[PDB]
Design a protein around this ligand. Structure first.
Ligand SMILES: OC[C@H]1O[C@@](CO)(OC[C@@]2(O[C@H]3O[C@H](CO)[C@@H](O)[C@H](O)[C@H]3O)O[C@H](CO)[C@@H](O)[C@@H]2O)[C@@H](O)[C@@H]1O
Length: 406
């Protein structure tokens, strides 16, 4: 009996002063002017803390050339890494992988620097390598056996990498491309997670739960097409490359198709599950914004209930509604910090579909492709509140003091 994000929940979704981030203004100069970057994740230790190699943090982004049309970046996404000594001033480390990477292009995942010093970069293999025309087949892959070397000058990630597919949908608990009714199926965004209570090793991902035709599982057959779910796999050995599929943590059946970049933050006794979702991926009769949605339980595989009653944790203002996306939450002392990327801004009133109308120059003019100002939020049980922001893409360590709040 999988925990459900229900239509009764989504009906309550509504922008409030506690969930709306300030307006994002473009940062004064870019770390890589030639490159657009989105969907970023942190190099973490096994426990989940941000990894530090000779005083450097490492982060990973999906990247495309800046001269490319924003709407098309997803077809040629390549994983680059960046490194920083403070958490503000990031240096471009270049592409992480030299070749032998799975899929026509790579989508978001996670990064593990294991106790043994071995590097695992989990990613989504979209399509198949050297395919004729672009396909939308997603499988959870890993580039294993990496090395992270750090001097006083910077960080280089050195090869060779052993690329292999880890998981594909079973067709019973997790929908395959064949079973996809309505929009394209999801099976992506593999996020590594060691449960600090059990010690057991898991891998979360975004999937869909298959719904048979005429299942009656919803109060209207078209609602059944919106079958988004947060899937999880287990490693009995704790080997980061050996996984068995488990039952999904949470489903948004009749509510939403895309429960994107799922991840868990554990805070005192409690498991907060966070997913980023779109306005256009909501089932008909429901109205929610592009935002970070969140749920809480007393255990990793517990009865998740939505934060703030509706599930909406954080969103953009009505007058800049696509300015950020692909938020990733992480603990810092008594605060929760949330890092998205700077998405589409200065649309005036145009919808995202309408941005494909405009001249190439006018399209690139309305896309950030940098890290958003990281949001500071305060959790209090099943309730959240925005407390303020930091500099663009500040990822601080727990050993660092943050500025005071108003
Ligand atoms: O797709 C690769 C990579 O991007 C992710 C998260 O950004 O999906 C993004 C997605 O939406 C993009 O395009 C929409 C407009 O349709 C825009 O509103 C949004 O800001 C963009 O991120 O792009 C694909 C399109 O098929 C969808 O999967 C998703 O809605 C993520 O899934 C992945 O790591």
């Amino acid at each position: 009996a999988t925990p459900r994000w229900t239509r009764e929940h989504a009906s309550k979704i509504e922008r409030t002063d506690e969930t709306v981030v300030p307006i994002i203004y473009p940062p004064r100069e870019d770390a890589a002017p030639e490159i657009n970057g989105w969907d970023t994740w942190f190099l973490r230790e096994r426990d989940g803390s941000i990894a530090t190699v000779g005083g450097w943090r490492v982060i990973f982004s999906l990247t495309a050339p800046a001269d490319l049309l924003p709407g098309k970046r997803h077809d040629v996404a390549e994983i680059r890494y960046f490194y920083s000594r403070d958490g503000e001033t990031w240096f471009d480390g270049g592409p992480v992988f030299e070749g032998g990477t799975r899929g026509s292009r790579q989508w978001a995942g996670s990064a593990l620097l294991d106790d043994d010093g071995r590097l695992y970069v989990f990613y989504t293999a979209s399509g198949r390598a050297g395919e004729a025309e672009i396909t939308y087949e997603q499988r959870l892959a890993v580039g294993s056996g990496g090395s992270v070397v750090a001097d006083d000058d910077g960080v280089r990630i050195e090869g060779p990498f052993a690329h292999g597919v880890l998981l594909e949908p079973d067709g019973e608990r997790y929908e395959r491309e064949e079973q996809s009714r309505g929009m394209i199926y999801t099976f992506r965004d593999p996020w590594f997670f060691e449960d600090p209570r059990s010690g057991k090793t898991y891998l979360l991902f975004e999937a869909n739960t298959p719904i048979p035709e005429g299942a009656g599982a919803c109060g209207d057959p078209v609602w059944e097409e919106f079958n988004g779910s947060v899937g999880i796999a287990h490693s009995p050995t704790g080997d980061p490359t050996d996984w068995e599929l488990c039952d999904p943590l949470l489903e948004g059946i009749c509510v939403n198709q895309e429960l994107e970049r799922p991840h868990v933050v554990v805070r005192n006794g409690f498991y907060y599950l966070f997913v980023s979702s779109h306005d256009h991926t909501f089932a008909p009769g429901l109205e929610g914004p592009d935002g970070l949605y969140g749920f809480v339980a007393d255990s990793l595989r517990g009865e998740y209930r939505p934060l703030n009653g509706s599930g909406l944790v954080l969103t953009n203002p009505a007058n800049a509604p696509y300015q950020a996306y692909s938020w990733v939450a992480f603990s810092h002392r008594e605060e929760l910090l949330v890092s998205g990327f700077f998405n589409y801004y200065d649309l005036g009133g145009l919808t995202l579909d309408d941005v494909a109308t405009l001249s190439p120059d006018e399209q690139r003019a309305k896309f950030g492709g940098t890290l958003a100002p990281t949001v500071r939020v305060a959790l209090s049980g099943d309730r959240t509140r925005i407390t303020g922001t930091l500099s663009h893409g500040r990822i601080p360590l727990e050993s660092e003091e943050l500025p005071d709040l108003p």
